[PDB]
Structure 1
Amino acid sequence: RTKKVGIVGKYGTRYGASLRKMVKKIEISQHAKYTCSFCGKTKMKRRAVGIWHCGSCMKTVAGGAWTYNTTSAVTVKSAIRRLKELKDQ
């Protein structure tokens, strides 16, 4: 239907092309449904900013503002596991 505007066609011409391009990436990720790591079903939607809910197993997870997992979160979780393992062994 569109060549490049995608999901930000709802804004028409009403903001800059670059601002619509930046929000295009974020609006795709904030409205996507992800696969739940707990039940395996692709029903992990966003309730509010930082709140992600699964409509099958009814699990609520604290995540990112627009994406389910922030890169800072993954690095910190991997680093804490390394620091914990160094303490134990």
Structure 2
Amino acid sequence: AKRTKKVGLTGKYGTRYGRAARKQLLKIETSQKAKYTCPFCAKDKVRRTACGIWTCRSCSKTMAGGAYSLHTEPANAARATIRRLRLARED
């Protein structure tokens, strides 16, 4: 049976710190506890180990990523633009 109605994982904070902060943490903290997909394993076993550092619990590969998620949207676009610039260098 569902135990809370809105606060979710921020129920650990009680009545403290105000509504705007707890709203931000629910989104941030859900993201950093998530399981992501090994770009190599192809299995859903990547977990954060420190800010910026992500390890597959199956591959055992270690990767550099975002602070609170595996891939950031700026880095996705950068990788996409860099790839097109290389292929254009090919005659």
Query: Which TM-score bucket, shorter chain as reference?
Result: over 0.9
SS at match of 2:9: helix
Partner of 1:24: 26
Partner of 1:45: 47
The 10-residue stretch of structure 1 (52-61 or 31-40) with the greater mean CA deviation from structure 2: 31-40
- The CA RMSD measured in Å over matched residues stands at 0.8
Counterpart check, 1:78 vs 2:80: yes
SS at match of 1:4: coil
Q: CA offsets, 1:3-60, max 9 Å, x none?
A: 1101111111111111000111010010111121211221100000000001111010
Letter in 2 for 1:42: D
Percentage identity across paired residues of the two chains: 56
Q: Give structure 1 stretches of 5+ with no counterpart.
A: none
Partner of 2:68: 66
SS at match of 1:53: strand
